[PDB]
């Protein structure tokens, strides 16, 4: 589509929370187009990155790419400045080939979109539990 | 957690299908927990597959991962059991430090979790087209 | 400019068909840039490509080059999926030099464009009659 | 270009039913949320109706939720509004509208007609 | 239903100078620093175009002639060189809650 702010809502473990992410442009050079928080100092922007790559002479397979980065920031004893102190990350990966109709690309969708909200994926990711 | 059925509902691009899954049991040489679909053969089934990995001395933080893959069975013919003709991947990864809290972990995965039904990615995934 | 979805109207022997191309991003290695239709199964979709010269301070001849290719589907009995009988290209390249102006390049586009709708055109390639 | 048209207009008794359509080319219409914002003649809006992306979430107020239904038609790229029960408050425009790409909806894009 | 109560309807302002339009609502209008508060423009012939969106963002096209502030229940919306064209009504919309309440419009 076209890069417009994307405001997302219902997040968090109460689902009370929102986030708006502004445009900032596609990169030429990888086809990467780039969504950001709403700050000054370029360190502390919570971003999604977003691209499709067409198949190649290498690959034979059409590459959605997703990335999340979150950093975390606190201002340290005897510093001014916030620091950013951790970083935390997300990278989905969808592949389909040539003949693939878009229906079974938006079953995957949607059930990756369904499987996050599960409570066997809210447990493996929010108490960092392996399923058992 | 424990692995039990999961029902994904309002799944598909109407919204109106059902993927139940049936659980595989884990691997004890990766420690990979695996989910196929209710009915099947082998080899003509959705699978779903989630791993959770603690830090070590190689790597310092927390990995989730889950992927899932589905085929697409053809009926050729001369022979009565089908064929798989393509596959449809997604594999994503989340990646988090040993001092991160449970809000952040749940905001990650509820913030791609709403992201993936905004129509920036909804037109990347099911469409293959780009952002401009 | 920046690429958009190009809605071309009034297309066909009869004039009435029409054609919605959508971005497909840039090729970083030779700065191709594509257009393509919303068509399922993407093997399958209407495609157009644009290439400029990236304008320098010692280019000599500037160059542009458009090609369309439409490809036709025919679902042969004893398959699944569609296949490629036949393709339909085009090819045009323009050649300029760096002390031409805006309105000779404007009158080599808008005769060319002019000689398509011309009765000459539209009778050696509609009807594959050579002039005589 | 984001252009979107009306039909089915109308003037009808009390009580009727009409059917209202929106034609909506210039992007991809399956991927976004459409509306309806209707505007009285005494020149105020009101928000009339929301559906989702394929159509599964579709959200009414309280002063419309018994009579009106919405819907889309992702081949034909055509947004539909089924008016029902009509009982005289119902004499606006009735404007489609694309919603943001959001949550809950700011309309971007307008259509005139009806 | 979150009522907002837009402003006194008119406002004769001259050619060259500076008009505020305000905008109240009933409730808060955060859920975390967002606003969510938007301001349309209706010229008398044609449908209301977007102007500014989250109570502070201008759309693609308009002439940066527009801006907005506000806090919580406080909108204004304001033009400082106020030229010809912007005599239009206009509304402020929120999408805080389910049900999406309008303005009631303020002519100049």
């Known amino acids: 589509a076209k890069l417009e702010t994307v405001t997302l809502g219902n997040i968090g473990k109460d689902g009370k929370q929102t986030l708006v992410l502004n445009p900032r442009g596609v990169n030429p050079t990888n086809g990467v187009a780039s969504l950001s928080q709403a700050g000054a100092v370029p360190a502390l922007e919570k971003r999604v990155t977003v691209s499709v790559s067409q198949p190649s002479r290498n690959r034979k397979n059409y590459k959605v790419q997703v990335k999340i980065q979150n950093p975390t920031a606190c201002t340290a004893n005897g510093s001014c400045d916030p620091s950013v102190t951790r970083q935390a990350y997300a990278d989905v990966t969808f592949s389909f080939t040539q003949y693939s109709t878009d229906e079974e690309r938006a079953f995957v969708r949607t059930e990756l979109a369904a499987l996050l909200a599960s409570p066997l994926l809210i447990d493996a990711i929010d108490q960092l539990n392996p399923a058992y | 957690a424990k692995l039990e059925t999961v029902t994904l509902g309002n799944i598909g691009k109407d919204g109106k299908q059902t993927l139940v899954l049936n659980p595989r049991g884990v691997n004890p040489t990766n420690g990979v927990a695996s989910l196929s679909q209710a009915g099947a053969v082998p080899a003509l089934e959705k699978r779903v597959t989630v791993s959770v990995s603690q830090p070590s001395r190689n790597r310092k933080n927390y990995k989730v991962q889950v992927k899932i893959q589905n085929p697409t069975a053809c009926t050729a013919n001369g022979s009565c059991d089908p064929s798989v003709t393509r596959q449809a991947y997604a594999d994503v990864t989340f990646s988090f430090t040993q001092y991160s809290t449970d809000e952040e972990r749940a905001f990650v995965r509820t913030e791609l979790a709403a992201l993936l039904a905004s129509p920036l990615l909804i037109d990347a995934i099911d469409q293959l087209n780009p952002a401009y | 400019a920046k690429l958009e979805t190009v809605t071309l109207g009034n297309i066909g022997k009869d004039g009435k068909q029409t054609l919605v191309l959508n971005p497909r991003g840039v090729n970083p290695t030779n700065g191709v840039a594509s257009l393509s239709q919303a068509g399922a199964v993407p093997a399958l979709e209407k495609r157009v490509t644009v290439s400029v010269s990236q304008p320098s301070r010692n280019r000599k001849n500037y160059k542009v080059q458009v090609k369309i290719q439409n490809p036709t589907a025919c679902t042969a009995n004893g398959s699944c999926d569609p296949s490629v009988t036949r393709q339909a290209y085009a090819d045009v390249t323009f050649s300029f030099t760096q002390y031409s102006t805006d309105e000779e390049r404007a009158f080599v586009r808008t005769e060319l464009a002019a000689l398509l709708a011309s009765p000459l055109l539209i009778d050696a390639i509609d009807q594959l009659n050579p002039a005589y | 270009e984001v252009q979107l048209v009306e039909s089915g207009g109308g003037l009808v008794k009390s009580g009727g039913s009409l059917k209202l359509s929106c034609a909506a080319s210039g992007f991809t219409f399956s991927s976004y949320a459409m509306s309806w914002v209707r505007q009285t003649p005494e020149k105020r809006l009101e928000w009339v109706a929301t559906i989702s992306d394929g159509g599964r979430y579709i959200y009414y107020p309280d002063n419309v939720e018994g009579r009106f239904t919405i819907s889309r038609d992702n081949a034909k790229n055509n947004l539909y509004l089924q008016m029902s029960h009509l009982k005289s408050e119902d004499t606006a425009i009735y404007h489609c509208?694309?919603?943001?790409?959001?949550?809950?909806?700011?309309?971007?894009?307008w259509g005139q007609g009806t | 239903n979150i009522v907002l109560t837009q402003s006194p309807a008119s406002l004769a302002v001259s050619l060259g100078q500076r008009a505020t339009i305000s905008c109240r609502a009933s409730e808060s209008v955060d859920n975390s620093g967002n606003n969510f508060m938007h301001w349309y423009q209706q010229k008398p012939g044609q449908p209301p175009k977007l102007l500014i969106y989250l109570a502070s963002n201008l759309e693609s096209g308009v002439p940066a002639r527009f801006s907005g502030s506000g806090s919580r229940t406080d909108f204004t919306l304001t033009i400082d060189p106020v030229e010809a064209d912007d005599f239009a009504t206009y509304y402020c919309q929120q999408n805080n809650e389910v049900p999406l309440t309008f303005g009631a419009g303020t002519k100049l």
């Open positions: 509208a694309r919603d943001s790409s959001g949550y809950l909806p700011y309309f971007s894009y």
